[PDB]
Design an enzyme around this catalytic site. Structure first.
Site, PDB file in Angstrom:
ATOM      1  N   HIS A   1       0.852  -1.157   0.043  1.00  0.00           N
ATOM      2  CA  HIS A   1       0.092   0.142  -0.160  1.00  0.00           C
ATOM      3  C   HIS A   1       0.870   1.235   0.130  1.00  0.00           C
ATOM      4  O   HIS A   1       0.482   2.244   0.050  1.00  0.00           O
ATOM      5  CB  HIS A   1      -1.154  -0.101   1.173  1.00  0.00           C
ATOM      6  CG  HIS A   1      -0.512   0.234   2.353  1.00  0.00           C
ATOM      7  ND1 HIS A   1      -0.300  -0.922   3.495  1.00  0.00           N
ATOM      8  CD2 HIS A   1       0.128   1.177   3.282  1.00  0.00           C
ATOM      9  CE1 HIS A   1       0.093  -0.345   4.334  1.00  0.00           C
ATOM     10  NE2 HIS A   1       0.345   0.838   4.482  1.00  0.00           N
TER      11      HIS A   1
ATOM     12  N   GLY B   1       2.902   5.638   9.895  1.00  0.00           N
ATOM     13  CA  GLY B   1       4.464   5.709   9.462  1.00  0.00           C
ATOM     14  C   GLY B   1       4.965   4.203   9.974  1.00  0.00           C
ATOM     15  O   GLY B   1       6.116   3.909   9.582  1.00  0.00           O
TER      16      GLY B   1
ATOM     17  N   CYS C   1       4.105   1.314   8.997  1.00  0.00           N
ATOM     18  CA  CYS C   1       3.818   0.052   8.319  1.00  0.00           C
ATOM     19  C   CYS C   1       5.517  -0.348   7.736  1.00  0.00           C
ATOM     20  O   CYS C   1       6.125   0.504   7.452  1.00  0.00           O
ATOM     21  CB  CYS C   1       2.934   0.088   7.379  1.00  0.00           C
ATOM     22  SG  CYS C   1       1.367   0.338   7.909  1.00  0.00           S
TER      23      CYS C   1
HETATM   24  C1  LIG Z   1       0.812   1.944   8.000  1.00  0.00           C
HETATM   25  O1  LIG Z   1       1.742   2.701   8.564  1.00  0.00           O
HETATM   26  C2  LIG Z   1      -0.614   2.111   8.775  1.00  0.00           C
HETATM   27  C3  LIG Z   1      -0.468   1.366  10.263  1.00  0.00           C
HETATM   28  C4  LIG Z   1      -1.469   1.891  11.131  1.00  0.00           C
HETATM   29  C5  LIG Z   1      -1.677   3.365  11.127  1.00  0.00           C
HETATM   30  C6  LIG Z   1      -2.130   3.725  12.565  1.00  0.00           C
HETATM   31  N1  LIG Z   1      -1.620   2.306  13.543  1.00  0.00           N
HETATM   32  C7  LIG Z   1      -1.257   1.562  12.535  1.00  0.00           C
HETATM   33  O2  LIG Z   1      -1.129   0.350  12.866  1.00  0.00           O
HETATM   34  N2  LIG Z   1      -1.475   1.196   8.071  1.00  0.00           N
HETATM   35  C8  LIG Z   1      -2.669   2.060   7.724  1.00  0.00           C
HETATM   36  O3  LIG Z   1      -2.968   3.105   7.933  1.00  0.00           O
HETATM   37  C9  LIG Z   1      -3.788   1.316   7.049  1.00  0.00           C
HETATM   38  C10 LIG Z   1      -3.408   1.369   5.366  1.00  0.00           C
HETATM   39  C11 LIG Z   1      -4.647   0.530   4.777  1.00  0.00           C
HETATM   40  C12 LIG Z   1      -4.230   1.117   3.142  1.00  0.00           C
HETATM   41  C13 LIG Z   1      -4.170  -0.745   4.706  1.00  0.00           C
HETATM   42  N3  LIG Z   1      -5.017   1.506   7.307  1.00  0.00           N
HETATM   43  C14 LIG Z   1      -5.257   1.584   8.415  1.00  0.00           C
HETATM   44  O4  LIG Z   1      -4.991   0.999   9.306  1.00  0.00           O
HETATM   45  O5  LIG Z   1      -6.975   1.746   8.609  1.00  0.00           O
HETATM   46  C15 LIG Z   1      -7.274   1.107   9.818  1.00  0.00           C
HETATM   47  C16 LIG Z   1      -9.031   1.685  10.038  1.00  0.00           C
HETATM   48  C17 LIG Z   1      -9.419   2.171   8.739  1.00  0.00           C
HETATM   49  C18 LIG Z   1     -10.650   2.430   8.775  1.00  0.00           C
HETATM   50  F1  LIG Z   1     -11.231   2.964   7.634  1.00  0.00           F
HETATM   51  C19 LIG Z   1     -11.643   2.561   9.803  1.00  0.00           C
HETATM   52  F2  LIG Z   1     -12.692   2.799   9.730  1.00  0.00           F
HETATM   53  C20 LIG Z   1     -11.010   2.001  11.332  1.00  0.00           C
HETATM   54  C21 LIG Z   1      -9.481   1.616  11.005  1.00  0.00           C
HETATM   55  F3  LIG Z   1      -8.922   1.079  12.259  1.00  0.00           F
END
Ligand SMILES: *[C@H](O)[C@H](C[C@@H]1CCNC1=O)NC(=O)[C@H](CC(C)C)NC(=O)OCc1cc(F)c(F)cc1F
Ligand SMILES: *[C@H](O)[C@H](C[C@@H]1CCNC1=O)NC(=O)[C@H](CC(C)C)NC(=O)OCc1cc(F)c(F)cc1F
Lengths: 302, 302
Positions: free
Chosen positions: A41, A143, A145
């Site tokens: 992603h 950040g 990921c």
């Molecule tokens: C990557 O760095 C990040 C890690 C997250 C950010 C906050 N804590 C983490 O572990 N990953 C993401 O932000 C992913 C990206 C996607 C494209 C896979 N999204 C994510 O974690 O979203 C969580 C989420 C999303 C929606 F829409 C919700 F309604 C609830 C929710 F928890």
């Protein structure tokens, strides 16, 4: 003396963390030999995240769209491919600090160390268990990921987790290093629910053995139980069934303490049915299930 | 999302650990530039340990009585001296992996990462607080002495602890890197008692702020308290007094959450007087006091 949740030393992995940037998206990558592994992603943008078509997004990218930074040094990307949910970026330089390593896909109930990283820079280290519902209870911010989980065995690093997302309940989900998610999750910006979780019974028993090895004996009793009768009580309290394979794995700890496994099961049954009555075990007022039998043997002694 | 007890990445310290052998006694040493630091009780034998006269023991030693092993490479000892409870061994080779570093003597209530080591080889990493009674609740076996505790700040390693002994209660005692014990302890093979311990109030408050930052709000109330009235209740439950300096240190966390410090004190008072009633905070059924305000800010975000 003492029993602590302990991570593996992280130096061998620290030397593998890089920053990967695609457009305005920055995350962490794992640099091994001349390949950088990172969550796919990284190639998404704001409106892509809802339901991205990753094959389309990747076909629209070229090598020069990827910026890899190893410390201060920029690495030249000379090829790219996608494997499941991971991006693989071929770079012109082999990592001189590449440890001996393997990629492993772990079973629920197994533990690993997480090296949390931001912008390619390690921030901290902590221990996690893969829960039965294929989440981990980590500590991850924006950040993070591309941070990885690992075990170390005689200077061979076994990588088993790469971080991709958080769930609405504050727990975390990711992939093996081949890009396959643990559990039913997908890499989209959506609220995803995990299955109901259960307690890892064999780990709770391992931790009760650690408590005895460390001189905590107040929860022992003279009673005993059958495996079938123990598992009836386990179901009532949302504990995983205990198998004969688990009994065998607890063999060494049972031999070192002189407490038969089904004897320790009778203690766990009474703890589940009566509570601790204000006492603690290894400093904990709740039963701990994120230590494997291996973790206990590794850290305990005589 | 999530809050975990997190150690610093240990790579910079791993490259400094060596094995020191004197006679049949082996422990760990810290190799920085061309000096190796280790506990002076490496020069003791079986009958020395009860009440050793270290100046006598050291005068009877020469450089060739000390074996230093850095991985597989033997280092030549070209000088030796004793500083308080640490031995300093000059070696013919400067450590090429010496990080930027400082030696610091910490105050009670401060935390640090421990790199547990055996035979010069790192085993695991975990976080510890210096308790008010100058013990730490670690995990140390035979052969762990010379393992060090540290903090990292912008690639500068601040060493603050070297391990020397266990107490009969299963807690641990050691020195700063200048060889001065934390607390009243001495390096003799004797049962030594620590003072009664107390709970680190400012850390408990920091951890309650972490819980709010992470979405745990059930323990908040509308009430408020004065600092003097809070400290009367703190004494009753064996909590350290809260000073105005502590209130100021909690300033940033208070500003980020919008909860005044004395407001969070009113929550802590009610938790101390009524318990949790079967609820948990950040997964804990007991109040946690080994996170400093700095630890919370370092790990939390928005
Ligand atoms: C990557 O760095 C990040 C890690 C997250 C950010 C906050 N804590 C983490 O572990 N990953 C993401 O932000 C992913 C990206 C996607 C494209 C896979 N999204 C994510 O974690 O979203 C969580 C989420 C999303 C929606 F829409 C919700 F309604 C609830 C929710 F928890
Ligand atoms: C050094 O490696 C070792 C670390 C100990 C060993 C087990 N867990 C640890 O943390 N340090 C010692 O063994 C020291 C050596 C002395 C010369 C300083 N002794 C020690 O820890 O003894 C503890 C002790 C001693 C007596 F005599 C008791 F009665 C109780 C007791 F806990």
């Amino acid at each position: 003396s003492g029993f602590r949740k302990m991570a593996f030393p992280s130096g061998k992995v620290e030397g593998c963390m890089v920053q990967v940037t695609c457009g305005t998206t920055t995350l962490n990558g794992l640099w091994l030999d001349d390949v950088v592994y990172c969550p796919r992603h990284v190639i998404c943008t704001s409106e892509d995240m809802l339901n991205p078509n990753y094959e389309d997004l990747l076909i629209r990218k070229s090598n020069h769209n990827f910026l890899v930074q190893a410390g201060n040094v920029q690495l030249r990307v000379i090829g790219h491919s996608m494997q499941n949910c991971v991006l693989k970026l071929k770079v012109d330089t082999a990592n001189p600090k590449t440890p001996k390593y393997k990629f492993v896909r772990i079973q629920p109930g197994q533990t690993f160390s997480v090296l949390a990283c931001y912008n390619g820079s390690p921030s901290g280290v902590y221990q996690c268990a893969m829960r039965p519902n294929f989440t981990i209870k980590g500590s991850f911010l924006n950040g993070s990921c591309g941070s990885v989980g690992f075990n170390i065995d005689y200077d061979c690093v076994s990588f088993c987790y790469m971080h991709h997302m958080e769930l609405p309940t504050g727990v975390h989900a990711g992939t093996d290093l081949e890009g396959n998610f643990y559990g039913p999750f997908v890499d989209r910006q959506t609220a995803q629910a995990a299955g109901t979780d259960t307690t890892i019974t064999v780990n709770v028993l391992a931790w009760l053995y650690a408590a005895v090895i460390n001189g905590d004996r107040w929860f022992l009793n003279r009673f005993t139980t059958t495996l079938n009768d123990f598992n009836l009580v386990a179901m009532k309290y949302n504990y995983e069934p205990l198998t004969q394979d688990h009994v065998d794995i607890l063999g060494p700890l049972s031999a070192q303490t002189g407490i038969a496994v089904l004897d320790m099961c009778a203690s766990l049954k009474e703890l589940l049915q009566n509570g601790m009555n204000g006492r603690t075990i290894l400093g904990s007022a709740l039963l701990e299930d994120e230590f494997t039998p291996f973790d206990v043997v590794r850290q305990c002694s005589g």
